[PDB]
Amino acid sequence: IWKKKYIKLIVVGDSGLGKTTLIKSLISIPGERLQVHDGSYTPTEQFRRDPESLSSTVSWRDEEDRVIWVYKIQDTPGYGDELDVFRNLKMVQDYIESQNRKWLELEQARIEDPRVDLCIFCIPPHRLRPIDLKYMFELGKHVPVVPVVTKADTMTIREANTYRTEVANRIANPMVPGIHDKINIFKFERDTLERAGVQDHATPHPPFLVIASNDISEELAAAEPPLFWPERRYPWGTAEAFNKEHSDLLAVRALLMKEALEEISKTKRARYEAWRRT
Ligand SMILES: Nc1nc2c(ncn2[C@@H]2O[C@H](COP(=O)(O)OP(=O)(O)OP(O)(O)=S)[C@@H](O)[C@H]2O)c(=O)[nH]1
Numbered sequence: 001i002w003k004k005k006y007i008k009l010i011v012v013g014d015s016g017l018g019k020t021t022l023i024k025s026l027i028s029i030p031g032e033r034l035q036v037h038d039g040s041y042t043p044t045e046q047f048r049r050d051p052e053s054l055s056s057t058v059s060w061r062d063e064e065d066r067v068i069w070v071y072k073i074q075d076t077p078g079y080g081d082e083l084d085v086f087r088n089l090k091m092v093q094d095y096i097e098s099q100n101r102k103w104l105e106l107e108q109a110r111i112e113d114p115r116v117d118l119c120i121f122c123i124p125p126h127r128l129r130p131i132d133l134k135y136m137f138e139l140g141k142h143v144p145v146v147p148v149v150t151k152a153d154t155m156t157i158r159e160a161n162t163y164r165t166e167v168a169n170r171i172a173n174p175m176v177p178g179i180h181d182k183i184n185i186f187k188f189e190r191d192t193l194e195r196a197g198v199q200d201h202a203t204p205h206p207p208f209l210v211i212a213s214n215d216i217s218e219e220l221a222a223a224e225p226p227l228f229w230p231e232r233r234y235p236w237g238t239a240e241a242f243n244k245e246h247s248d249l250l251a252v253r254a255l256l257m258k259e260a261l262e263e264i265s266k267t268k269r270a271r272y273e274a275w276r277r278t
């Protein structure tokens, strides 16, 4: 009767960029559980000895299509947590490979799908470094990448417009030694981007610029009924994560959690098929 479909995202980036805060905002679709982060750092050892404790899950039903979506977002430690950046890269690459070997062993015997479909690559504000592009390239060889600039409240409007173009340009032309193929960026359809409320910039395929917060408005949480409004309250003013003029966060969630569900699931068999030559 019901058909179950599975999406698994993995989130990667440098340490302290707000990866875990962003994850908790993404899976906290209104109507669901409202999950929040406490600001502590994601330890490398925890990902090694208990990666499931770093996985967030949400599920919902599509009545008309008779589909049960099971959505997982895998958190990872920042690749600045240790001395060697490429140890983190290998750890994440091995995680993706391990999920494929799980699916193969289950398919051999025979269906809870553990495979990774998409990577959210969190980019620091103001400056994109060669190691970020190197990480993005090598990771893209295993899974398509969605670039997201976090902590967008770090940049003025003018800085943000300049950086959005620079990030898009560097991804198309990294100019990093050893990168000789294109970075595997996931291409969303325009109809999908428009339905999600993505603004149509002059720069093609820009990154998303998000603000996320584990703090909520005290005034709005005291409403009847309470309204949950993530905010970042500074002495000079308050940035709002759900404000379309401050943050792409709501557009990112609509894109990844709703509008792009089909085209992410479609490319699943092709990706795994290419992987099988191993
Ligand atoms: N200025 C600003 N700070 C943010 C934003 N999102 C999260 N932060 C802050 O960044 C700090 C770390 O956030 P966190 O989500 O834990 O980063 P992280 O990437 O997961 O850290 P890691 O150790 O696991 S690698 C917290 O103080 C949080 O409040 C944001 O959008 N703007």
Ligand SMILES: [Mg+2]
Residues within 6 Å of the ligand: 019, 020, 021, 040, 041, 042, 075, 076, 077, 078
């Ligand atoms: Mg974290």
